[PDB]
Write an enzyme that holds these catalytic residues in place. Structure first.
Site, mmCIF file in Angstrom:
data_model
loop_
_atom_site.group_PDB
_atom_site.id
_atom_site.type_symbol
_atom_site.label_atom_id
_atom_site.label_comp_id
_atom_site.label_asym_id
_atom_site.label_seq_id
_atom_site.Cartn_x
_atom_site.Cartn_y
_atom_site.Cartn_z
ATOM 1 N N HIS A 46 1.526 -2.768 -0.412
ATOM 2 C CA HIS A 46 0.929 -2.864 0.118
ATOM 3 C C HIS A 46 0.364 -1.337 1.114
ATOM 4 C CE1 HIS A 46 -0.163 -4.652 4.190
ATOM 5 N NE2 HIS A 46 0.414 -3.932 4.440
ATOM 6 N N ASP A 82 -1.801 0.145 3.434
ATOM 7 C CA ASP A 82 -2.302 0.400 4.126
ATOM 8 C C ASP A 82 -3.473 0.865 3.827
ATOM 9 O OD1 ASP A 82 -1.514 -1.684 5.880
ATOM 10 O OD2 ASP A 82 0.555 -0.771 5.854
ATOM 11 N N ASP A 134 0.088 -8.393 6.547
ATOM 12 C CA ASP A 134 0.920 -7.964 7.837
ATOM 13 C C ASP A 134 -0.131 -8.271 8.811
ATOM 14 O OD1 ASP A 134 1.698 -6.804 8.889
ATOM 15 O OD2 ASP A 134 2.100 -5.067 7.670
HETATM 16 ZN ZN LIG Z 1 0.217 -3.423 7.101
#
Ligand SMILES: [Zn+2]
Ligand SMILES: *[C@H]1O[C@H](CO)[C@@H](O[C@@H]2O[C@H](CO)[C@@H](O[C@@H]3O[C@H](CO[C@H]4O[C@H](CO[C@H]5O[C@H](CO)[C@@H](O)[C@H](O)[C@@H]5O[C@H]5O[C@H](CO)[C@@H](O)[C@H](O)[C@@H]5O)[C@@H](O)[C@H](O[C@H]5O[C@H](CO)[C@@H](O)[C@H](O)[C@@H]5O)[C@@H]4O)[C@@H](O)[C@H](O[C@H]4O[C@H](CO)[C@@H](O)[C@H](O)[C@@H]4O[C@H]4O[C@H](CO)[C@@H](O)[C@H](O)[C@@H]4O)[C@@H]3O)[C@H](O)[C@H]2NC(C)=O)[C@H](O)[C@H]1NC(C)=O
Ligand SMILES: *[C@@H]1O[C@H](CO)[C@@H](O[C@@H]2O[C@H](CO)[C@@H](O)[C@H](O)[C@H]2NC(C)=O)[C@H](O)[C@H]1NC(C)=O
Ligand SMILES: *[C@@H]1O[C@H](CO)[C@@H](O[C@@H]2O[C@H](CO)[C@@H](O)[C@H](O)[C@H]2NC(C)=O)[C@H](O)[C@H]1NC(C)=O
Ligand SMILES: *[C@@H]1O[C@H](CO)[C@@H](O[C@H]2O[C@H](CO)[C@@H](O)[C@H](O)[C@H]2NC(C)=O)[C@H](O)[C@H]1NC(C)=O
Ligand SMILES: *[C@@H]1O[C@H](CO)[C@@H](O)[C@H](O)[C@H]1NC(C)=O
Lengths: 291, 150, 108, 269, 75
Positions: free
Chosen positions: A22, A24, A146
């Site tokens: 993941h 961001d 998320d």
């Molecule tokens: Zn995130």
């Protein structure tokens, strides 16, 4: 795509290990700081290294699979590569050793975004993949792990983009509790009260542990979980207990889902910086348990 | 003239830690920064587009701070034009509100006929704005002319 | 020398919205047209009813020479696409809330 | 003789004793009150360490406080506009407008630098109050498309045990929100995505701005504090009043005129 | 019971779910409000950072106009 899928062992419980990262596109650092790995003090994370490793680790064992999601990071890395590397990677995608999950420029939020803006964003990612890998690099499922809650419109949008499934991590705690007790972790989401079914019918699956490894099996350079030790004459030997743990861990989870299948998300925020720490141990894990 | 930079920044801001405002202050500053830098190439594109579509010779300009009653051109020029573009698939009868100096302005429409105008005052800041109706075609634009009477 | 412009020859009916008009490439535009009303919002004017549109001459600024149907994100050819099924226990027509995406070759 | 502003389609009244919007009407009359209230942000208590923050909204009190019980009005009636300026406070003021032939009432709010000098984090809201019986139901738009029905303390999917009466009733509103007694509808359009809900019946509310001085332990590691130029914000709210059966078409069409608005470019000549 | 673990992608796991030909229940509502535990709701970011939120929804209106004009002109 689907014609590239692995061999499931019917009449057994199947655990699909899904290695991932993941990334961001900005949060505690900026996009350039995350891509390059600047100010690792604020947060240790450098996506250019993550992509290099994954590729190597994929050429190291043809069994290994990897799914990458943020096109904004990949897009950059890509222009940064040589024709050689690009020719190679395209082959990893062709045979599905490298698969794309969401396909958007980023993994957008669902509460404050405008439906029109979400589309420009998606088209932008899917556009890159499209003209770089063709049909072979087109996502099949959507990957929101998320975002904080989910909008019915999002489901409608993905359904209309031709996605077959959509998986996610965050849902109300009370909702989750009930779902696991009611064996309802997975179902079909009718996201439109206007469009005629199957148009806005997106399949939905609620992941197990948000999106992180099961407690004790995190092998990234960021976790400190004990690694797999096989040497039988070595005091650090934990291969046996390891398998005993897993088996119990898997059959426990199976009970929560309707089919002989369950996922295990192996990775978290900015992992696989050193992709090998993950794959080396995972390889042994798969061998020792299927053994 | 490039629309690519802004399309890209709008994508970035779509992240889940961006527009949601759940990122750190410096990342929130760099987000706005990427957007600011995407607005330039676009108005460059918008200038060429219009110059081509209307043939008009003047160098266009944009008023980014209408947001707070600030626009050097409309508070200084004695003669200027207002190009109002409408993105909707139907006509718009929209009100224009530009900041002007303490004078009287005459407004002429596309045809040249004098259209109703009115200089309104902003309470407490003692500065004012010129107002008038702008009729715009769908997917089109209209060019009105303004001049401060002596 | 050109006080007023418009890109359409005949404007969109109230129940429709020009979602996207864009430059996809050198001689290629991206167009999306959605039906901004959901079933029930008729508001007494059959605004929720389906609408049929002609795309030949809708636009004046340019002319459409070729057209090709697409999925929302414009990455597949709608006619050549398909999704897995699930058991639960020119003239383009639009239904409430339907968004259609097109890649059309043009000439100015 | 009361404070009034009008145009072809609507007529707004202001309460003589307060300077607050008292009545709105279609030339359908509707007694509606509007005002700015704030929520005393929570830093935690014996019930849970949790505190309001960049992500989490947790009031240490379910009842908001008036930013002020009255507003100083200044009438401005021009040939092309009719606006009532309202001054609630040094960090709060609004302009209520009615332009030529526009079906809605414009409420331009400016929530200046929120005073955190009292050491209390605050979350501001504009709340409209009415008598139209809504039975706990209200509507919100999902990312500006289809509209989902919402019920106070209720869950379509399971049997909810509410832990926060105010917090657990807030939903994202990206373009609009509305409340109807089945007969007349009051709808509010926004210029940006905000939070909102119908806490008491016949009422409504959107969240204009918030300033907390304590992180909410979810990752950011910093209080939604020190936003700089952002400390001071100005936005609009478009109020729509019509019968339930005619509302739809109006909020749809104006909502689109709101996002795909006209662009202005100037040229000297 | 028996167990078989393997490398896999979210897409392959979905192909197996389809292959099973089951019948699933239906969801017709959104997943708001999100709450990872008592007394804590993730409903505050719905308004967090008003300025930026507006700057973006405005850049949208702008990019659009930008797009439409690039389309109407033929460089
Ligand atoms: Zn995130
Ligand atoms: C009404 O509508 C408004 C929208 O229309 C709405 O939003 C506001 O919109 C306006 C414009 O419409 C926005 O204004 C722009 O904002 C940009 C962003 O500004 C902020 O970020 C800058 C960069 O930040 C990074 O770098 C700094 C140092 O360089 C650091 O201090 C930061 O911490 C941050 O660092 C991080 O990122 C680095 C990489 O960038 C990285 O290396 C580093 O490690 C770290 O990770 C800051 O410079 C800027 O600061 C200025 O302003 C603050 C005020 O808060 C002061 O304290 C500072 O001293 C400083 O003056 C902000 O933090 C701006 O970049 C942008 O500026 C350009 O454009 C304006 C006019 O539009 C020009 O005047 C200006 O000269 C700039 O042009 C320069 O760049 C261009 C191309 O960009 C170039 O052509 C030219 O040469 C020139 O050099 C502009 O100001 C504004 O951000 C929006 N506000 C908000 C809150 O979102 C508004 O809210 C509405 N109003 C209402 C309703 O009230
Ligand atoms: C609203 O009225 C208030 C009066 O309280 C104005 O604020 C005061 O303004 C004077 C001079 O401008 C300052 O000296 C005071 O310090 C201000 N009050 C404070 C901060 O204590 C305010 O400017 C008005 N707001 C409007 C109408 O925009
Ligand atoms: C509603 O929520 C509350 C808190 O989540 C639940 O009550 C708490 O339950 C725990 C143990 O289960 C106790 O130790 C706490 O003392 C309780 N909180 C208080 C102060 O009452 C409650 O069970 C939920 N509603 C139900 C009955 O499902
Ligand atoms: C808003 O919250 C504050 C903080 O809880 C309330 O006052 C409190 O804070 C004081 C120091 O800042 C403490 O010493 C007090 O004990 C505490 N008050 C209480 C709850 O006992 C304040 O009253 C609240 N403001 C209003 C007017 O609602
Ligand atoms: C790949 O690299 C070679 C240099 O070996 C370069 O000449 C070629 O143009 C590149 N690929 C392209 C653009 O055909």
């Amino acid at each position: 795509g689907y014609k590239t899928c692995p061999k499931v062992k019917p009449d057994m419980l199947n655990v699909h290990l899904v290695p991932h990262t993941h990334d961001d596109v900005g949060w505690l650092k900026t996009v350039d700081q995350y891509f390059y790995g600047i100010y690792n003090n604020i947060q240790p994370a450098g996506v250019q290294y993550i992509l290099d490793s994954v590729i190597s680790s994929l050429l190291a064992n043809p069994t290994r699979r990897f799914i990458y999601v943020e096109i904004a990071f990949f897009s950059r890395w890509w222009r940064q590569q040589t024709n050689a590397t690009q020719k190679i990677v395209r082959e990893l995608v062709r045979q599905g050793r490298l698969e794309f999950a969401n396909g958007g420029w980023v993994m957008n939020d669902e509460a404050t975004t405008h439906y029109g803006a979400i589309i420009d964003q998606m088209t932008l990612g899917l556009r890159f993949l499209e003209e770089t890998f063709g049909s072979d690099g087109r996502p099949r499922v959507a990957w929101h792990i998320d975002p904080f809650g989910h909008s019915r419109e999002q489901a409608s949008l993905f359904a209309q983009m031709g996605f077959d499934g959509f998986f996610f991590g965050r849902l109300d705690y009370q909702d989750k509790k009930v779902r696991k007790k009611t064996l309802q972790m997975e179902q079909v989401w009718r996201a439109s009260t206007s469009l005629k079914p199957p148009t806005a019918d997106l399949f939905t699956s609620v992941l197990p542990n948000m999106y992180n490894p099961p407690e004790g099996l995190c092998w990234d350079m960021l976790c400190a979980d004990k690694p797999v030790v096989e040497d039988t004459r070595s005091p650090e030997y934990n291969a046996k207990e390891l398998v005993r743990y897993f088996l119990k861990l898997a059959t426990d989870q199976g009970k929560l889902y309707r089919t002989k299948h369950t996922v295990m998300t192996m990775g978290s925020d900015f992992q696989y910086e050193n992709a090998n720490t993950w794959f080396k141990n995972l390889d042994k894990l798969i061998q020792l348990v299927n053994a | 003239g490039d629309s690519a930079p802004l399309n890209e920044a709008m994508a970035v801001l779509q992240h889940h830690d961006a527009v949601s405002g759940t990122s750190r202050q410096h990342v929130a500053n760099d987000y706005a920064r990427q957007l600011s830098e995407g607005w330039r190439p676009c108005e460059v594109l918008m200038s060429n587009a219009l110059a081509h579509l209307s043939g008009l010779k003047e160098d266009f300009a944009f008023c980014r701070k209408l947001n707070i009653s600030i626009c050097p051109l409309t508070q200084t020029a004695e003669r200027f034009q207002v190009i109002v573009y409408n993105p909707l698939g139907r006509k718009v009868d929209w009100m224009v509100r530009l900041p002007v100096s303490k004078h009287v302005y005459l407004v002429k429409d596309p045809g040249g006929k004098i259209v109703p105008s009115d200089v309104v005052t902003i309470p407490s800041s003692d500065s004012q704005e010129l107002l008038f109706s702008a009729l715009v075609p769908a997917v089109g634009f209209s060019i009105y002319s303004v001049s401060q009477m002596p | 020398p050109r006080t007023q412009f418009s890109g359409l020859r005949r404007e969109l009916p109230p129940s429709v919205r020009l979602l996207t008009l864009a430059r996809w490439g050198p001689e290629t535009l991206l167009l999306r047209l959605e039906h901004q009303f959901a079933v029930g919002e008729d508001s007494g004017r059959n605004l929720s009813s389906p609408v049929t549109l002609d795309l030949t001459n809708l636009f004046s600024a340019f002319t459409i020479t070729n057209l090709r149907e697409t999925t929302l994100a414009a990455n597949q050819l709608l006619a050549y696409a398909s999704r897995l099924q699930w058991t639960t226990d020119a003239t383009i027509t639009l239904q409430p809330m339907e968004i259609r995406t097109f890649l059309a070759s043009v000439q100015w | 003789r009361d404070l009034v502003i009008q145009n072809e389609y609507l007529r707004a009244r202001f309460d003589p004793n307060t300077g607050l919007l008292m009545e709105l009407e279609n030339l359908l009359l509707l007694p509606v009150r509007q005002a700015f209230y704030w929520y005393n942000a929570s830093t935690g208590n014996n019930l849970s360490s949790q505190a309001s923050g960049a992500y989490i909204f947790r009031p240490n009190q379910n009842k908001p406080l008036f930013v002020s019980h009255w507003a100083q009005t200044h009438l401005v009636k021009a040939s092309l506009v009719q606006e009532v300026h309202q001054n609630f406070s040094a960090w709060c003021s609004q302009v209520v407008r009615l332009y030529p032939r526009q079906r809605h009432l414009e409420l331009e709010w400016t929530v200046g630098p929120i005073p955190v000098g009292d050491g209390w984090g605050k979350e501001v809201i504009s709340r409209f109050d009415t008598a139209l019986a809504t039975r706990g139901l209200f509507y919100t738009d999902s990312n500006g498309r289809e509209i989902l029905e919402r019920r106070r303390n209720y869950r379509p999917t399971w049997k909810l045990n509410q832990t926060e009466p105010v917090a657990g009733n807030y939903y994202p509103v990206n373009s609009r929100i509305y409340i109807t007694d089945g007969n007349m509808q009051l709808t509010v359009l926004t210029d940006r995505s905000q939070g909102g809900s119908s806490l008491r019946d016949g009422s409504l509310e959107l969240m204009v701005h918030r300033r907390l001085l304590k992180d909410d332990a979810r990752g950011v590691g910093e209080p939604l504090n020190k936003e700089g130029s952002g400390l001071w914000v100005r936005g609009r709210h478009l109020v729509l009043l019509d019968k339930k059966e005619t509302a739809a078409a109006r909020h749809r069409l104006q909502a689109e005129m709101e996002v795909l608005a006209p662009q202005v470019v100037l040229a000297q000549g | 019971i028996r167990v078989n673990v393997l490398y896999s992608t979210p897409a392959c796991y979905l192909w197996e779910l389809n292959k099973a030909n089951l019948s699933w229940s239906v969801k017709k509502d959104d997943f708001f409000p999100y709450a990872d535990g008592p007394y804590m709701f993730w409903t505050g970011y719905f308004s967090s950072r008003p300025a930026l939120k507006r700057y973006e929804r405005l850049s949208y209106n702008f990019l659009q106009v930008c797009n439409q004009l690039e389309a109407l002109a033929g460089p």
